[PDB]
């Protein structure tokens, strides 16, 4: 550990933007659409769409862990604490060569294969007061989730029920104990944000996460169900996360696509409610892959040599 006190701001961390831009370029030479459409305006309202048609090679895009080592004239500083807001003065900081192996998983609503919370479930937010700022949840115990191009994902109803609890409890432990915690599905928006979207085998899965976010701080949902089955769908025409615009990928082909990932975290986003009675409603969120990266770099910060 480094014997000094420094400031950290994962919400304004620059490595996030440095990885994000990398992960995008890690996408332009691995997953290339058959056609990519992107807004093109002079400002005069009228906006032509810039079209691009390239080969559409079916590649089973399988993410490789990524390290981030400071070159020279530069040093990475890691923060150490069982519960770090990731936005303030860190006491147990410590210089490191490369950040832990991170598997740049691009997804929405659920953070897959990320890094678990050592102690307990932690939830960071650039401002919990602002019903506009994504709440990044960090699970201390991942929940396996298996998706298949066959059309769905299975999740443990047990583990997910617990998780919502040990999350619902960490929420009120920030918005007011004497406050009811509820979970509802997406409010609306793009398919990629409304469902738990992500990529598996180069196939863009779109799983309906209603059964994962319709939890009332009162009842249950395990009648005749041992596992939660999200009705997933693979799309060819998708909205790009790298930049405003659609993109069409070629249909599936491999006799079988399969994924078994660790739900290591979520991206929630409680609704304003305009100071109404203690009844905070949290819904799935994300779509801004940087929050993802953040959830992984929340405790890092590269700095110039002295």
């Amino acid at each position: 550990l480094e014997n000094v006190t420094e400031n950290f701001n994962m919400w304004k961390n620059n490595m996030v933007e440095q990885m994000h831009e990398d992960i995008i370029s890690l996408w332009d030479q691995s997953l290339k659409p058959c056609v990519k459409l992107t807004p093109l305006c002079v400002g005069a309202g009228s906006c032509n769409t810039s079209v691009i048609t390239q080969a559409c090679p079916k590649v089973s895009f399988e993410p490789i862990p990524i390290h981030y080592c400071a070159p020279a004239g530069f040093a990475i500083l890691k923060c150490n604490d069982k519960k770090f807001n990731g936005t303030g003065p860190c006491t147990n900081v410590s210089t490191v060569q490369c950040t832990h192996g991170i598997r740049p998983v691009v997804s929405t609503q659920l953070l897959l294969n990320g890094s678990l919370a050592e102690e307990e479930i932690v939830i960071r937010s650039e401002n919990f007061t602002n019903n506009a700022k994504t709440i990044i949840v960090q699970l201390n115990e991942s929940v396996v989730i298996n998706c298949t191009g066959a059309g769905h994902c299975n999740l443990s109803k047990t583990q997910w029920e617990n998780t919502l609890e040990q999350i619902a409890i960490k929420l009120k432990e920030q918005f007011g104990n004497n406050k009811t915690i509820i979970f509802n599905p997406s409010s609306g928006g793009d398919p990629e944000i409304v469902t738990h979207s992500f990529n598996c085998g180069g196939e863009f899965f779109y799983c309906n996460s209603t059964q994962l976010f319709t939890w009332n701080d009162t009842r249950k949902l395990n009648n005749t169900g041992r596992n939660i089955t999200l009705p997933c769908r693979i799309k060819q025409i998708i909205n790009m996360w790298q930049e405003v615009g659609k993109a069409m990928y070629a249909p599936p082909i491999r006799g079988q696509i399969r994924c078994s990932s660790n739900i290591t975290g979520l991206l929630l986003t409680r609704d304003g409610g305009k100071d109404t009675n203690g009844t905070e409603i949290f819904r799935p969120g994300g779509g801004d892959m940087r929050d993802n990266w953040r959830s992984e770099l929340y405790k890092y910060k590269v700095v110039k040599i002295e």
Epitope: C34, V35, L37, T49, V51, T53, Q54, A55, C56, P191, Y206, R233, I234, K235, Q236, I237, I238, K246, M248, A250, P251
Partner: antibody, heavy 128, light 110 residues
Framework: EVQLVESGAEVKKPGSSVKVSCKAS????????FTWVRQAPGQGLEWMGR????????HYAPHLQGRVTITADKSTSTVYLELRNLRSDDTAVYFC?????????????????????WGQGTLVTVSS | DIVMTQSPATLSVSPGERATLSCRAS??????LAWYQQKPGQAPRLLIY???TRATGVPARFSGSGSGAEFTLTISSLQSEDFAVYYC???????????FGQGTRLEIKR
């Protein structure tokens, strides 16, 4: 199960431009990708291009790029094929052809090259 | 740039008999190959697609065979109505640059 209807046969003169219509009915328009296939008398099919309707993108035949365009009016449910700078050889029966693509209005898209549904065909005579 | 050549420019055969057509392709077109049938003065007719799969509502006598650059639309007991020119369509490259065969007339030999 769609039924494609085309505009009337037109007699255009050299160096001009022609626009053939193609009414698509009987199913979900945006779920189809339409292709124009021309055929000169005595000659055989020649791929003119295809419009991935829903996306409003269309790719064309090498020997036509520049002088041809394919557009679709989702409102009226029509597809159009425009050839400009008409030559005599362009004289042919221009066919309108389409294929189902899948729940394209839902992100699903097979992007099929073959053509399951064909038009009645529109003849265009480009001569002086 | 793909050339699709239908070797049998013309095939004279009699009803009930078995007629065979062969479409030759430049480079490999995998299985993105369809077959069409055209009666004089009619829009083509999608017979086979994906090389070996008949289009909805088509006589089982039409056999779609092949893969790569060698396809074959073989027909068992040819029928009176089976007289027409046959066309193979290549639609495997992308960007889209589909090409048609030059044809084959399935004329009745008498």
């Amino acid at each position: 199960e769609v039924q494609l209807v085309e505009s009337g046969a037109e007699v255009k003169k050299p160096g001009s431009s022609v626009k053939v219509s193609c009414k698509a009915s009987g199913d979900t328009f945006i779920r189809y990708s339409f292709t124009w296939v021309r055929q000169a008398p005595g000659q055989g099919l020649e791929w003119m291009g295809r419009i991935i309707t829903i996306l409003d993108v269309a790719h064309y035949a090498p020997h036509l790029q520049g002088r041809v365009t394919i557009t679709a009016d989702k409102s009226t449910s029509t597809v159009y094929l425009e050839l400009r700078n008409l030559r005599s050889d362009d004289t042919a029966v221009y066919f309108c052809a389409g294929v189902y693509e899948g729940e394209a209005d839902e992100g699903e898209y097979d992007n099929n090259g073959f053509l399951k549904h064909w038009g009645q065909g529109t003849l265009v005579t480009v001569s002086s | 740039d793909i050339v699709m050549t239908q070797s049998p420019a013309t095939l004279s055969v009699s009803p009930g008999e078995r007629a065979t057509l062969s479409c030759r392709a430049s480079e490999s077109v995998s299985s993105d190959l369809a077959w069409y049938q055209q009666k004089p003065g009619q829009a083509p007719r999608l017979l086979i697609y994906g090389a070996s799969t008949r289009a909805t509502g088509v006589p089982a006598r039409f056999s779609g065979s092949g893969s790569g650059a060698e396809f074959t639309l073989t027909i068992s007991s040819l029928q009176s109505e089976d007289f027409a020119v046959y066309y193979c369509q290549q639609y495997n490259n992308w960007p889209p640059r589909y090409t048609f065969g030059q044809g084959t007339r399935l004329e009745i030999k008498r």
